[PDB]
Design a protein around this nucleic acid. Structure first.
Ligand code: EJH
Ligand code: CL
Ligand code: MG
Ligand code: NA
Ligand code: NA
Ligand code: NA
Length: 326
DNA sequence: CCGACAGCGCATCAGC
DNA sequence: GCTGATGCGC
DNA sequence: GTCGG
């Protein structure tokens, strides 16, 4: 990437804010500014040039000059010398270990990947799976593998019922050439706004995908969200594909477009879009867009026949998925 | 010179 | 066991 | 940490 030095610096600072400081707004400030710089098709030569882009303010501007002049930030190399913070930063890379579990492990002298393996009985189920697949979960999914995973998933849900609708969202739907995980929006013509005839629909889909040994592990399970692990089959004598993370969301169809807007992202896009909706008197979640009252109460769901309908309520021009990569 | 910063699903734990 | 918070994740 | 009021 063209400005990868700057975007790497900003990402590291962002990871520090989230993993150690727990300064979630600082986290989001660095990652927003990293996002715009990464999408900027021009080689940033100074913090002043950077300060013209949205998200880049005084302090990021200053840090870009320091990095462009020295190749590093003082703040970053003091963090890399802090052994508690660096241990914490590493442990939060394991799926299921956050700042709270990380600093509890550090205080027990659990500090390295091998330490975790030696004390696996101290991990909850999620953390075990993150540890088991730690290397795999550091690997990106080439788009060609996403296509083969989409192939299995979409056919399998048709097998459990031919009217099922499955849409692979996330970065894949935005056109990314590789993705971190797989995000599947699932909906069924029989399933409208939580009208209770018979739930259990997600379990049936999960069951079938376990049956064919595509889904290999379970991180979470409820009526609307399944999170877990999956794997492409190999031909005889190829290396196994890495295990991959998978999130499947079951949503009523009348909420399908709010659902696919949410699951397509990006997370920063959703934050920006939902904030702007607040600025126009609405609130957006993965299910509905509602009007906000003068006092904060939310209204009844508004009708939606397309993603574009939601952009229209808040007076945005429609952005195609490939330009939502904020 | 300040306060806002999206909104949710699920698993686990602390205290009862 | 339940509530309610905290934790981690999307 | 940024931005908007
Ligand atoms: C983390 C996050 C995700 N989402 C929505 C929006 C988001 O697009 C969707 C999937 O979450 P994802 O973590 O899989 O993000 P992704 O775009 O797929 C890429 Cl980062 P990759 O996974 O390909 O590496 O969930 C949010 O709305 N808020 C969030 O805080
Ligand atoms: Cl913050
Ligand atoms: Mg994803
Ligand atoms: Na600016
Ligand atoms: Na993690
Ligand atoms: Na995900």
């Amino acid at each position: 990437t063209l400005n990868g030095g700057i975007t790497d610096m900003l990402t590291e600072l962002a990871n520090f804010e989230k993993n150690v400081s727990q300064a979630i707004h600082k986290y989001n400030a660095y990652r927003k500014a990293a996002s715009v710089i990464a999408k900027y098709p021009h080689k940033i030569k100074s913090g002043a040039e950077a300060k013209k882009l949205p998200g880049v303010g005084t302090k990021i501007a200053e840090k870009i000059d320091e990095f462009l002049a020295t190749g590093k930030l003082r703040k970053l190399e003091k963090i890399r010398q802090d052994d508690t913070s660096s241990s914490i930063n590493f442990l939060t890379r394991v799926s299921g270990i956050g700042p709270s579990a990380a600093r509890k492990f550090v205080d027990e002298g659990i500090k390295t990947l091998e330490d975790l393996r030696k004390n696996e009985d101290k991990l909850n189920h999620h953390q075990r799976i993150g540890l088991k697949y730690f290397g795999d979960f550091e690997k990106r999914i080439p788009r060609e593998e996403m296509l083969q995973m989409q192939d299995i998933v979409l056919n399998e849900v048709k097998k459990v019922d031919s009217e099922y609708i499955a849409t692979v969202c996330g970065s894949f739907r935005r056109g990314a050439e590789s993705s971190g995980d797989m995000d599947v929006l699932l909906t069924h013509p029989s399933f409208t706004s939580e009208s209770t005839k018979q739930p259990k629909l997600l379990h049936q889909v999960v069951e079938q995908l376990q049956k064919v040994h595509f889904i290999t592990d379970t991180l979470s399970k409820g009526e609307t969200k399944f999170m877990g692990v999956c794997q492409l089959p190999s031909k005889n004598d190829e290396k196994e594909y890495p295990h991959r993370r998978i999130d499947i969301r079951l949503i009523p169809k009348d909420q399908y477009y709010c659902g696919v807007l949410y699951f397509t992202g990006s997370d920063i896009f959703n934050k920006n879009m939902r904030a702007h909706a607040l600025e126009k008197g609405f609130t957006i979640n993965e299910y509905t867009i509602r009007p906000l009252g003068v006092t904060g109460v939310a209204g009844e769901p508004l009708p939606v026949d397309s993603e574009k309908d939601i952009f229209d309520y808040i007076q945005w021009k429609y952005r195609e998925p490939k330009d939502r990569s904020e």
